[PDB]
Symmetry: C3
Subunit: 308 residues, 3 copies
């Protein structure tokens, strides 16, 4: 019933910078003002203040493992608190590595939740199969149960508890996956929808199946982790890893409009909005408004109209 924006302007997740300005842009985009305008109430948790672990030594390859392990541990702590009160937790953040704290904290109250991860990537690189070391590409690794133990524990993420099985997570939009990640998902029979399947089935049937897969038997809580680079660059240019032939505005919306319809949206995740990475101030607006549009959608803003 209630909503709670938890700013998470973290950044250490990846090399490029400018992702901590995300909650700023979105909020500056009047996000909370339009969201209240829905048949929901909104409590802004305000942005979190992350402590930066000194002499953060790159564990093996993994850059900033402590700082990141920590800033995340803090989010889960906070995400678990608001969820514990029965509120949908929208997390305005920086890089997807902050999905570690989001989900975990969410998973702590509802161990049986499921994940509809929308992104053009899998972010399932273990600190081993990972080329270079930017955690914004390892989330699913720290969370998947079937993966724990298959890589060296990282300094600062021990607090985590693999909380979801491969039968609880579904991917949508994939188009730029690595050899390792591909292996891992294939090896674990994870249900996904690469842009190939979409092009084939049409976003319409993608949801019917994503839903008949995750909510077929039981009807548990849903954790939507929306990565902005999931929608074609023509719509979300202000990101770090833009990939053409992606999801469109109308698709990103059919996805959110459908998640609303279920009535199970428990925890959202709007990540990767990088204002700084806009070739023109316009690109940052196109990204910020369709990031917001998406949010509002998850809360009822249908495209056919909404009367009180």
């Amino acid at each position: 019933k209630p909503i709670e924006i938890i700013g998470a302007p973290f950044s250490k997740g990846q090399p490029r910078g400018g992702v901590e300005k995300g909650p700023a842009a979105l909020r500056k985009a009047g996000l909370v003002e339009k969201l209240k305008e829905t048949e929901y109430n909104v409590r802004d948790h305000g942005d979190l203040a992350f402590v930066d672990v000194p002499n953060d030594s790159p564990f093996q390859i993994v850059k900033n493992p402590r700082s990141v392990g920590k800033a995340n541990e803090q989010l889960a702590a906070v995400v678990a608190e608001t969820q514990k009160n029965g509120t949908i937790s929208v997390v305005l953040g920086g890089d997807h590595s902050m999905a570690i704290g989001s989900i975990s904290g969410h998973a702590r109250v509802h161990p049986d939740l499921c994940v509809i991860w929308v992104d053009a990537h899998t972010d399932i690189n273990t600190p081993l199969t990972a080329s270079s070391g930017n955690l914004h590409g390892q989330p699913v690794a720290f969370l998947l149960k079937e993966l724990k133990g298959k890589f060296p524990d990282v300094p600062g993420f021990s607090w985590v508890t693999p909380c979801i099985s491969a039968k609880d997570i579904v991917y949508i939009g994939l188009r730029d996956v690595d050899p390792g990640e591909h292996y891992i998902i294939k090896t674990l029979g994870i249900k996904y929808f690469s842009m190939t399947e979409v092009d084939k089935l049409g976003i319409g049937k993608v949801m019917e199946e994503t839903f008949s897969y995750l909510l077929g038997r039981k009807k548990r809580p849903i954790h939507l982790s929306f990565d902005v680079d999931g929608l074609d660059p023509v719509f979300t240019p202000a990101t770090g890893t833009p990939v053409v032939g992606g999801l469109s505005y109308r698709e990103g919306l059919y996805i959110t409009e459908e998640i609303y319809k279920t009535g199970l949206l428990s925890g959202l995740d709007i990540m990767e909005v990088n204002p700084t990475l806009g070739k023109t101030p316009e690109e940052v607006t196109r990204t910020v408004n369709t990031a917001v549009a998406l949010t509002l959608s998850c809360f009822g803003t249908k495209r056919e109209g909404n009367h009180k």
Copy 2:
């Protein structure tokens, strides 16, 4: 069998200006020259000359109610004359408020026609539920029978006669509807196809249903009122109310190509082309050529080729 372009460079419908240049752009785009090249004959009625009602006092909120009531009254007068002769009336115009005279005049000869209103809006705001007062958003209100009487009669539109029921009109492309308009359409069980339904069913099935709904029982005449902002801004940027995630070139065409196939196209409506509103001369070309493409399409120009 014959066609008749009726320029309608009216404008008072909305605030922004530059819509009276539409028939000029379109015609300047060699519209009539390519249209003749079809298996049809074309008679250009030339642009209408609209009298501007002096001291046009904003009735309640409704801006320029007289001037607009009048310019429209004139169109119907003219649209009824050419229709009365058995000719398909293409109306190159300014704002959609000129759809009042178009349909009315059309409806006068064929009371049983039906409407396939393609636009990203509903234009069903009554002079009451309407925020601000630009008639380019009230057409469907002056025409729907079920609505007459539910708002103060406006100075200059009395001549109108609500000529169509909610079972005679279908919407295609909707994406930016108001609370009032949404209420009204929902309250009147009007058949519509928001971008949601499209994304789901795919433009292909949208037509089969729009057709099985309007022409299921009888096979009456069709009045296509094509609003240019119905196609994504990426295609029709030169408009006043651009809304992302709209109909694409290929969709606007499948729509027209299908209407041709029925063989019932009686009266067309190409509205909202605003040359002035192009950030670059290019945007006005992209709008003018795909506005034309659309027209030609309504007349047989299939995408698989056309041999004499």
Copy 3:
């Protein structure tokens, strides 16, 4: 199992110039370097050196009939040699008129191959029904059996042997067909998929049918002749005959990804990349990378990932 790039920087096919730089751009785009990175081996045949027939007198209308007849005769000669060794022949070339030597040479080793011609055109103009005389629009004419004899034999193409029936070729993407070409395809009951059919069925079903049509009975070798202007100009602007409302990146790929899946790709054809025709160096990159993406795709580069 093995692949062999055969540069074919020919050009005389059409008026505009800059198509011989295609193999240069593509290769310069690291085409062969990424292609080897597949589960395939690659042998670059290097670019061909075409002799230019002196005093090439425009036979009737057909411009440069000798030069073109010859440069093509050479390709078939070469395409037949590598195919004769059991290698998939990718032909980096200029204008589609070089598809004459490609297919012919291919057809010589496998007379029973079939053609999936992806383009926005039919290239089936006979030296008679053809307006102006640029052979880049007559290929299918020199190859179709049902057409041989219906036009004056051309100086330099006699070596050709119509090698495919209208039941062996399928079209995908059509949107700008002439009166003659339309006639000819209609008159010969050729299976095609104009952008209309795509918009209706969705690229997904287009392949199931293109496949159930050509590979229904027997499962013969496939000859994909990919014309770059088959994908909307927004993706392949660097061509000579750009036509809006075309195939998109995701569609061009679903097409290639599917052809890979069959396992019958015998001979490819990447034509019409014109570096010179890019309004901005960017347009030439957008064209060269999605031309390459396409190639890679035909060889296994799925969008869900590829692990060794």
